[PDB]
């Protein structure tokens, strides 16, 4: 073992040092938040501030990592392997960022998504605060119980996605669909004006969405587009005015079809399946709470 | 009674053979999903791939069905009648699809909805995996308990649908409704300009929907249109900006009518009735879980 | 201290006097409601009515405060300090309003937000009615338990806000973004017309919102705009048709990016985190109920 | 007592006679539903059908009422007063409808809302079926417990309505509100073009709604308009894109005002208060269930 390992390790496990590292984690997260709030642009105004602040924070986190490993004989396989691994990863990326800032573009412009991993340093705060840790451990021990109902709900969503691609993937392909009125029957016009040509019972409504598509291509053009449409319907977002109603009204006497499609999907998936997923989730969490 | 049926039956009931059939079921479902994702068009690009893949899967499922029935003396009334029946149905339709692919269009172009039954083969996976089976059996033994509250909610929805057809089925029939504003009263204009004709207190807003209708014809034109509108309101989808608010502000001084209509519907049906339906559902399911 | 305080105090604690003050509180709140309903304009029609009504109510509430303090030897630190403090604050502001109405504009035009504090006098009704008090005390003793899950949910929302500002803060900056067609592949046009120029596979859809912005600037232009966008998505409001879908379909072949962004956010935050927050809230409240 | 009262009364209490009256109730409700589905128009096509069908149903229900009262000595104060009263009311209105159909317009054209009371005859089915009765009695014994939390939520909604009328009742009164963009700071234009006049940092977006109003007049023009707006926000309907966001982005630098307004309202009312109302409701119902 290292001749300086024991007292240094019990020093890093001290209450105050953990609280100080926590303060430093929260300050770094607030620094990233503030960068995105006051300086989000491409051509930044205060670039050196964020750069050297990230540099100083990465230096302090590297020193903290070294104090950590120095106290556990630099192994970190044996003691608290998960958080030590996550810390090693984030500080390794931070050192990569230091090198990138100083002496060149070590990484290709492609994988900057890894530079974006600074935001996830805040997850290290969950280890120190016993309440957030309690919440995330309950969540983790609750998710496998959810897995089954989740797989059932996804199976049904893919069934409905196949059905939707088969049925509606060409609704409004011309860019327009026709809906038929009840004009003469209701009172708005007399039957003679229709036969003469003064009024009509069909309206050639247009089908373009605000994304430039047609109704069918965007909402059910492919299987993943349809699965996404059914996710948006599962969360209840504009499922009628944008998704359902153009389909329901496009077909003049076959309105039972799309109506039953969307009503059955909503009932089954939304009500029953989402409530069962959430119910088993909360059940698992109250299990772990007690 | 087959000579080696007992030995054969055991093979079908083996763990590995059931897992292999399950793998084959999931692969066929993924094949259908992939067909709809990479080749959804009418004029397909790789038509032979999907055709002969469905053919091979149908052949393997037919062989599995024959191994099944050969092990139960080909009766299938006495042992596991429900799943055996469902399997017989889906493989019969698959054999119909094989015949359709090879030697002619046996079925009229009308009932292709039965060729679409391939997507529902995945339901056979629920029998083999004990967790999904555990979920669907709880759901099935929970639904009859829901029946009562569901019938109450539907009774109230049909009441509101009759009321809505009687009241609003002609709202905006001209295509336009007038709304009145407090321009002189609020400060936007002086009372003299109104009497002279410079300003007005009414705006002839148009009532056409994005479906080509008028507000009344589409949302409450008939009883089933109104019942569908009330379903969309029960799920909370654009109930105000699309459904309620044009009615509420069509009336000059009797805005209490539509307001009370939609507020009472939302409160009663949405909050109380949906939460009671879901509550008895989850109660029944937790009953069966324990 | 006072000679007859002992009897005056037990008189102010009487059932009937508390019920009368409650009636007076509710009448004052109804008076403010009626002012905003029948006379909301800037140039009011009946200004003296509301002014002198607020004056009379403030006078009666001042007399009630003096009867209160006269009964507790004018200390109010010792006995019921919280409600006495709130009452002193609101009646002090009411006396400020009396002075403002009579002999000048004592307060700058800036902080009228404090004249708006009349609406919050109704909170004094919660002290007298034992049921509303029972509800708000349970709520208060439930909120600290919520604090932890709330902080976790906010941490995740700020993570997603940083990610969103980095990714989408320039989506549609030109005011238009391009979405790509599958026209030749589907059947709507033949490949030759595209190469000749008769049809196209891209639509230059416009990105301006009904707020005059572009999609990126409004929804994720800064970190607080993005945090607000993610709040609107957390409540389920137009998260797809307004927020998600233009991003999802802006990308030609990398639609997995925005799709996974919004789907992961919705699942995690909406379903899991909101249900856990509400579950611990209701759990704490049922704890205090029993 | 009546000489024929006892056996007639125990005959009307028979299982089969109650089931037959139930069948007749459901058939009458289906008749009204079918009238609204197949013949909703003003100038009906089959008017005699609905008229004489309502006549026959009213005759049968009158005969049922007379058999009822004949069995209870025509008192109906003593035995089952509530349902007997409701039945007497609905059959009295039905007899009024018979008279109206035969020998003149007895009622002014104003109160036809009472002819619309046919739809509510179906409520008489709840007495005969022991499950629906079991649900509505639990609901009735659950509502008084809800009363307290409901009154708290309504108090907070009226507070927010007063605040909203004071703040936003004039937002966009000109019909247009100005919003400001970071064009120069972002990269879309250079600062010189702004000072010269080629670009700008403000966009005069229009504020008219699809009802013809301005944002302020419609959403918070008065206290009841504001209370309705806050109801629509409480149910989550377009609270951001229609209600919140124009207010939030109308303000240049004080966007914290409307943001905090709507965020605080949503959190408090929606999450906490709606979940507490529904929780005490379901708690009371599970109390009565067991």
């Amino acid at each position: 073992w290292l001749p300086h390992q024991r007292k240094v390790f019990d020093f890093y496990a001290s209450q105050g040092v953990q609280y100080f590292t926590a303060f430093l984690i929260v300050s770094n997260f607030i620094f990233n938040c503030a960068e995105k709030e006051w300086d989000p642009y491409t051509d930044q105004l205060y670039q050196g501030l964020w750069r050297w602040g990230e540099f100083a924070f990465n230096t302090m986190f590297l020193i903290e990592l070294l104090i950590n490993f120095y106290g556990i004989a630099f192994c970190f396989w044996r003691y608290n392997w998960a958080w030590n691994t996550f810390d090693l990863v984030v500080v390794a990326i931070g050192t990569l960022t230091m090198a990138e800032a100083i002496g060149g573009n070590f990484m290709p412009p492609s994988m900057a998504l890894i530079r974006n991993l600074r935001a996830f340093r805040i997850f290290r705060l969950f280890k120190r605060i016993k309440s957030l840790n309690k919440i995330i451990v309950s969540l983790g021990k609750a998710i496998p119980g959810v897995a089954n109902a989740f797989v059932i709900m996804v199976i049904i969503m893919c069934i409905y996605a196949i059905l939707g691609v088969e049925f509606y993937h060409m609704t409004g392909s011309d860019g327009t669909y026709v809906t038929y009125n009840d004009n003469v029957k209701r009172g708005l016009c007399t039957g003679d004006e229709v036969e003469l040509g003064q009024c009509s019972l069909n309206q050639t409504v247009s089908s373009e969405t605000a994304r430039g598509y047609t109704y069918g291509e965007e909402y059910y053009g492919t299987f993943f587009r349809a699965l996404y449409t059914l996710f948006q319907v599962l969360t209840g977002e504009s499922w009628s005015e944008a998704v359902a109603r153009p389909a329901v009204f496009e077909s003049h006497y076959d309105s039972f079809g799309p109506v039953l499609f969307y009503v059955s999907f909503i009932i089954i998936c939304q009500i029953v399946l989402i409530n069962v997923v959430v119910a088993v989730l909360l059940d698992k969490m109250v299990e772990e709470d007690d | 009674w087959l000579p080696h049926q007992r030995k054969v039956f055991d093979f079908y009931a083996s763990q590995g053979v059931q897992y292999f059939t399950a793998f084959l079921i999931v692969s066929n479902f993924i094949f259908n999903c992939a067909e709809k994702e990479w080749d959804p068009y009418t004029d397909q690009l790789y038509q032979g791939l999907w055709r002969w893949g469905e053919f091979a899967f149908n052949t393997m499922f037919l062989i599995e069905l024959l191994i099944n029935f050969y092990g139960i003396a080909f009766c299938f009334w006495r042992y596991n009648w429900a799943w055996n029946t469902f399997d017989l149905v889906v493989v019969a339709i698959g054999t119909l699809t094989m015949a359709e692919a090879i030697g002619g269009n046996f079925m009229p172009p009308s009932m292709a909805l039965i060729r679409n039954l391939r997507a529902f083969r995945i339901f056979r996976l629920f029998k083999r995996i004990k967790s999904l089976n555990k979920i669907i059996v709880s759901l099935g033994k929970a639904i009859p308990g829901v029946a009562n509250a569901f019938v109450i909610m539907v009774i109230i929805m049909c009441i509101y649908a009759i009321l809505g057809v009687e009241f609003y089925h002609m709202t905006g029939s001209d295509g336009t409704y007038v709304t009145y504003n407090d321009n002189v009263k609020r400060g936007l204009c002086t009372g003299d300009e109104v009497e002279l004709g410079q300003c007005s207190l009414n705006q002839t807003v148009s009532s056409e929907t994005a479906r080509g209708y008028t507000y009344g014809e589409e949302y409450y034109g008939t009883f089933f249109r109104a019942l569908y509108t009330l379903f969309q309101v029960l799920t909370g989808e654009s109930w105000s900006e699309a459904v309620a608010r044009p009615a509420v502000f069509e009336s000059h001084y009797d805005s209490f009518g539509p307001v009370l209509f939609y507020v009472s519907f939302i409160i009663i049906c949405q909050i109380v009735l949906i939460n009671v339906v879901v509550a008895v559902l989850l109660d029944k399911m937790v009953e069966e879980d324990d | 201290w006072l000679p007859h305080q002992r009897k005056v105090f037990d008189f102010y604690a009487s059932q009937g006097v508390q019920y009368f003050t409650a009636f007076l509180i509710v009448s004052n709140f109804i008076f403010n409601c009626a002012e905003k309903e029948w006379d909301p304009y800037t140039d009011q029609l009946y200004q003296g009515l509301w002014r002198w009504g607020e004056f009379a109510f403030n006078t009666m509430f001042l007399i009630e405060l003096l009867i209160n303090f006269y009964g507790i030897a004018f200390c109010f630190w010792r006995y019921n300090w919280a409600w006495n403090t709130f009452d002193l604050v609101v009646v002090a502001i009411g006396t400020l309003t009396m002075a403002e109405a009579i002999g000048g504009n004592f307060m700058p035009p800036s902080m009228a937000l404090i004249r708006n504090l009349r609406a919050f006098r109704i909170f004094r009704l919660f002290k007298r009615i034992k049921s509303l008090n029972k509800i708000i005390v349970s709520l208060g003793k439930a909120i600290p338990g919520v604090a932890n899950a709330f902080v976790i949910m906010v941490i995740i929302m700020c993570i997603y806000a940083i990610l969103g500002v980095e990714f989408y803060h320039m989506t549609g900056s030109d005011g238009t973004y391009v979405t790509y067609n599958d026209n030749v592949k589907r059947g709507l046009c033949t490949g030759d017309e595209v190469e000749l120029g008769q049809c196209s596979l891209n639509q230059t859809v416009s990105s301006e919102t009904a707020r005059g912005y572009t999609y990126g600037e409004e929804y994720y232009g800064t970190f607080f705009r993005a945090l607000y966008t993610l709040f609107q998505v957390l409540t389920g409001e137009s998260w797809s048709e307004a927020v998600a879908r233009p991003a999802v379909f802006e990308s030609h072949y990398d639609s997995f990016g925005p799709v996974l962004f919004y789907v992961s956010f919705i699942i995690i935050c909406q379903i899991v985190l909101i249900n856990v927050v509400v579950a611990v809230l209701l759990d704490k409240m049922v704890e205090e109920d029993d | 007592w009546l000489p024929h009262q006892r056996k007639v009364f125990d005959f009307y209490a028979s299982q089969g006679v109650q089931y037959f009256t139930a069948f007749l109730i459901v058939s009458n409700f289906i008749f009204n539903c079918a009238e609204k589905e197949w013949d909703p128009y003003t100038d009906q096509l089959y008017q005699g059908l609905w008229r004489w069908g309502e006549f026959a149903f009213n005759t049968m229900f009158l005969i049922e009422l007379l058999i009822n009262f004949y069995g209870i000595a025509f008192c109906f104060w003593r035995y089952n007063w509530a349902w007997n009263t409701f039945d007497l009311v609905v059959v009295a209105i039905g007899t009024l409808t018979m008279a109206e159909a035969i020998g003149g317009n007895f009622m002014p054209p104003s109160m036809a809302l009472i002819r619309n009371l046919r739809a509510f005859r179906i409520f008489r089915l709840f007495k005969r079926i022991k499950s629906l009765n079991k649900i509505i009695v639990s609901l009735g014994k659950a509502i008084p417990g809800v009363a307290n939390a409901f009154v708290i939520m309504v108090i907070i909604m009226c507070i927010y309505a007063i605040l909203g009328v004071e703040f936003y009742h004039m937002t966009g009164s000109d019909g247009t509100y100005v919003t400001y963009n970071d064009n120069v700071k972002r990269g879309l234009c250079t600062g010189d073009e702004v000072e010269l006049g080629q670009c700008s940092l403000n966009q005069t977006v229009s504020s008219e709604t699809a009802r013809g109003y301005t944002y302020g007049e419609e959403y918070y023009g008065t206290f009841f308009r504001a209370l309705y707006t806050l109801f629509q926000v409480l149910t989550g309907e377009s609270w951001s894109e229609a209600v919140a966001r124009p207010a939030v982005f109308e303000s240049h630098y004080d966007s914290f005002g409307p943001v905090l307004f709507y965020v605080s309202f949503i959190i408090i009312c929606q999450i906490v208060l709606i979940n507490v109302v529904v929780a005490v409701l379901l708690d009371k119902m599970v109390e009565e269930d067991d």
Binding site: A279, L282 | V286 | L282 | -
Partner: peptide, 16 residues
């Protein structure tokens, strides 16, 4: 919130 209620019940009844 039924999911919450059910979990609460199960926990209490199981303890009982």
């Amino acid at each position: 919130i039924a999911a919450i209620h059910n979990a609460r019940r199960k926990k209490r009844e199981a303890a009982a």
